[PDB]
Point group: C3
Chain length 421, copies 3
Amino acid sequence: VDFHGYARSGIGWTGSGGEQQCFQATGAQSKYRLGNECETYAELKLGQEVWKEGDKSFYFDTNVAYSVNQQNDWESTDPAFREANVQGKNLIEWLPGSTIWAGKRFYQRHDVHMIDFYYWDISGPGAGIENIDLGFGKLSLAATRSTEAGGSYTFSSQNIYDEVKDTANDVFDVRLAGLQTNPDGVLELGVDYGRANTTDGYKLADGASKDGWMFTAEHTQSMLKGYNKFVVQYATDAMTTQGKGQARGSDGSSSFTEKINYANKVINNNGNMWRILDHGAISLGDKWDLMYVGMYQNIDWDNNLGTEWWTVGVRPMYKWTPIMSTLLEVGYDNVKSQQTGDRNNQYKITLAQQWQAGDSIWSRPAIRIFATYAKWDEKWGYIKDGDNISRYAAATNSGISTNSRGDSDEWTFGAQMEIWW
Amino acid sequence: VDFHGYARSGIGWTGSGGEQQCFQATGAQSKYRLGNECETYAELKLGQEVWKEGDKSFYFDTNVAYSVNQQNDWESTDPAFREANVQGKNLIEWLPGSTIWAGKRFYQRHDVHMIDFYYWDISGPGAGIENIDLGFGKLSLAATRSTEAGGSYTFSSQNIYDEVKDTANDVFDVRLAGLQTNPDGVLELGVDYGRANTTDGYKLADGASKDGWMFTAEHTQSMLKGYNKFVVQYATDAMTTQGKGQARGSDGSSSFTEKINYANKVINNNGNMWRILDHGAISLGDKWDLMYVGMYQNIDWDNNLGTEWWTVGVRPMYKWTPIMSTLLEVGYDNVKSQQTGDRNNQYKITLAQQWQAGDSIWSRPAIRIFATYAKWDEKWGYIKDGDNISRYAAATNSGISTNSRGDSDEWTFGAQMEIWW
Amino acid sequence: VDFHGYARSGIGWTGSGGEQQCFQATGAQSKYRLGNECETYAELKLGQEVWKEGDKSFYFDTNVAYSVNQQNDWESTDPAFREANVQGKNLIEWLPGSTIWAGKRFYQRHDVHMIDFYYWDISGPGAGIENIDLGFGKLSLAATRSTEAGGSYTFSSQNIYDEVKDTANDVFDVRLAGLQTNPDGVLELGVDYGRANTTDGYKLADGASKDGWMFTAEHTQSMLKGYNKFVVQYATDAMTTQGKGQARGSDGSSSFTEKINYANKVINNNGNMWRILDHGAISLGDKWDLMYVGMYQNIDWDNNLGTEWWTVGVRPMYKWTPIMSTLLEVGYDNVKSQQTGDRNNQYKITLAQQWQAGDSIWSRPAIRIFATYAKWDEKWGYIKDGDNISRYAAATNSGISTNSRGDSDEWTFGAQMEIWW
Ligand SMILES: OC[C@H]1O[C@H](O[C@H]2[C@H](O)[C@@H](O)[C@@H](O[C@H]3[C@H](O)[C@@H](O)[C@H](O)O[C@@H]3CO)O[C@@H]2CO)[C@H](O)[C@@H](O)[C@@H]1O
Ligand SMILES: OC[C@H]1O[C@H](O[C@H]2[C@H](O)[C@@H](O)[C@@H](O[C@H]3[C@H](O)[C@@H](O)[C@H](O)O[C@@H]3CO)O[C@@H]2CO)[C@H](O)[C@@H](O)[C@@H]1O
Ligand SMILES: OC[C@H]1O[C@H](O[C@H]2[C@H](O)[C@@H](O)[C@@H](O[C@H]3[C@H](O)[C@@H](O)[C@H](O)O[C@@H]3CO)O[C@@H]2CO)[C@H](O)[C@@H](O)[C@@H]1O
Ligand SMILES: [Ca+2]
């Protein structure tokens, strides 16, 4: 049996008191993770090549995830059963080298490690055929599913309904990778079309976006014993909410019962998204490794409830010895509310001493001892409707109750381990 | 460590819209599974032979099961811890070859794969000694437990009680296997006696069945590079509800509080069950394999709330190549309500293209692409008491709200993987 | 992958009726386990030495625990994710042989097997450096965390608060082990300082103990092919509730809302605890093994709600053959309520026939068939406030509703397996 996975766990303190606190800018879809992770997360994968005959084989893979708050020894949880699929390699004679698969699977995910941000992730239940050799590149086709809560109604009279149902969103994915564009440079193109797919008799409330498209272009350049990836993505309507390739076609739906059930008008995700990303990991000589990110993301919703986000960060690693190093991470986030026009910003600086299994910025396991400082100035926040957070924003100053963190700073410190195997 | 288990996962669509839907005749205890399974189910077993000295050994086995709806990537669930037992082989000198065991264990289960129907399954917490060599056959003795919710009350006066408690049901199982009845034919006999076992002070409500018996005779005939199993089973009272060997002695109990607690009259399972089953798997030459089932089951309850069920099905497999085949599954169900006398029927046809690790209808893993068509005509259904389904039936036409699916049809299609290792 | 763990599972019956019942003296923190365990408990550990280079290595370990009531086959549960840590050996050149670690971990726990009682257990999220060689002994430093529910309030005026929060309790642990005091005798000394650590803005209600100390001295003497451990521990205030090294600094807090939130005065754990323990496992010749415990524990609280507990037990094993033996366990508990001055007592006798993987009282797996008899006389119980048990006690006779079991006896019998691997 093959044992693989990922895990992080630690203990931390907040300078002003109590357990460690993690800092993320209101409106930003991520945070600079070094010394800024507040939970024990673990994925335990058990897989096996169950059959092999010649060039043909069947591989079975699983994945059970656990997330606990690391507050005590005994911590109960509901594990997420994320993967359970079978991959058959070389079974289709006329499509030599291709792999056919079916089941729940993390499918060709693309992420930026330092901000733990996935920008191309259509994982979930699915099926497809990958690595079809076109000579000049590899073609991959796949269909996966996601499901939204509610959104499908059996309308009796106009917007009064009898029953609600969860809405299945299908995604059809096509990717062409390995296009040699220049020496040591490769290009991958991808298209995603997603849509809400309602059960017969059910319908989406008035105004649901229904569907959308997403286009991705990623260029990988090998250099400095590492790489640099340049990404450009454009998403449309239903693909703007999740923003990684999964469709949210009934996003914004709601209803109220009095007992006559009324399906409110959908406060939809019609609009578009532009993401220009550039990240990499390179070696600057014998003693230095460097990870970096630079991203501009603009979610332009017709309804004007979107955000414009800028994030930049850098993580240099100095190698004292092959197993010991000092890491520094500096990250900056600036988010502008499309609705109010105000801006929120945060910058965090983390200094960590580390012992890792190898001399790479990518070597894991790693045991860290760190100190983090975060300073933020948030001029807006989402209107906190009691306990639930609204899609609407309000300036911190306007007496409205928002989830804005205000203007402040804090520092934390502690120990942590991270590992993938 | 030994890694074993079972898993199925896939993605599907309903011809008329939305996610895949699965078809089972109202009143039937199973359904024809090919291209008619709607969840990701997986059992991960990790076991080990922990000690061995000569012919003696101790084997430790576990089993953790997961069932998720395959609607998204992240799906939390409460896994069922189903097995955790130790088996000691050859420890009893005077009972050479026998195995003694204790713990939660899937104990000698008998099922029909194509309809995923278990007909002899007393699994659960238990202990026993199996494979005692009698020369002309093997004797096995076991005691397992199951528990019903409520059913035990501390009666103060009449049907008024202070406290309720869950009811333990003990099963005492005896089996004699390996009786050579004819060339290539073997017979196994089994007897099960089960009873609700109340805690001192507690009592079952009026009408509870309390105990029952079940008798099983299974003949296995080796032929056509496969087999044919003929089964005859007769169950009495408490053994008719589950119908596989576990006792439901307080089945039908209920109470209402106003705060004076009243234990209603138990609408018991007194009566009998007859099951005549014939299923098999054989090879018809080089290119054909075939699975088939034929079953008649009659649950005759004193209260007339039972059912008479007929099910027949066939699953031929045509081998294009050693790893690729086309499967067809045709199954028919007919259920007569003992109460109303009405009949429900369904027939489903499934066509699937498959790639499997081997050339047997039993080879797994398997990756399938299928299309299913189901047509049904249901004249009755269980009275849907609001959201909960009642033990009482009503004709579809009688204005009463039942769970009957009426007269209709549907078709689905998708991809799925199934594997046992 | 390294597979390790612990598991127990069985089936039992109570002489007077129904499932097996387990016997523990009201007020006692443990019970004599042989044939007196009523659940299936299992810990499945999957670990791996993920990197090694010379004398340096990184070991990754995990632990997922399950506890089910063994009442049925399918039993859903929320597993506890208890361990996920990395240990790096020999990474600090100037502290040769020491191991640094971070993550959730069972850290150097000390327990008495036969009563399943842990007396030194600060396990949980943490980090530390162990086995620093001092020549005359080994030094270990660690910091772990535990969390209490509520206990931290944002007070607006007096004892009226806006928000509550869970309270983090930090423990700083120092141990010196391996002090050679006499031939075949070794001594370990340990100090624990724990304190509630509140988030800025939050405060503990009035009267909270806030912090405390615990001192441990354990002497191990090797003899009779086994050992004898003599332990003396003294705990103070916040360390008296859990009593194993973890801090409960806001223990006793409560609040009531009317909506004005009032934080009641903390019914604290100020006081002290004395624990004098002596346990061991030795071999008396070829046919006899013996486990024994003797303990006096006195929790003297200022609020007079503590207990004085005496427990003594013996478990001799007679070896019929190398894999078969007869075990007898006799245990006695006597608990005096500090509050009422009344005493509760229980004695249990267990006789078991066992088959184990080896000839030691410590050999596992083991399959047992047993019969247990327990007789108790409880003069007091904790005031059962409806369904919840209070910190206050009352004599059984005083018409007050307590959880006292009265004066009675019972006997059970069954089969069970236990294993650690
Ligand atoms: O294994 C390869 C990748 O491993 C690392 O990715 C980790 C993330 O660091 C970790 O946060 C976690 O991400 C999940 C996230 O926690 C969860 O809330 C979200 O819903 O799904 C995320 C995807 O699982 O797990 C992944 C590994 O699965 C590493 O950061 C990355 O660079 C590697 O490519
Ligand atoms: O492993 C040998 C058997 O494997 C297969 O049986 C599977 C079933 O196909 C699968 O549905 C599942 O059955 C369980 C069912 O899903 C659950 O709801 C019920 O409560 O318990 C059932 C028993 O576990 O798991 C079994 C494997 O345990 C195969 O179909 C069968 O022919 C093989 O003998
Ligand atoms: O593995 C070494 C130890 O194994 C055995 O200890 C078991 C206990 O017997 C078992 O009850 C369980 O204890 C846990 C308890 O059930 C749980 O409720 C509590 O919160 O935590 C306890 C610690 O896990 O698990 C331990 C093993 O972790 C054996 O009894 C002991 O002597 C061995 O040292
Ligand atoms: Ca749960």
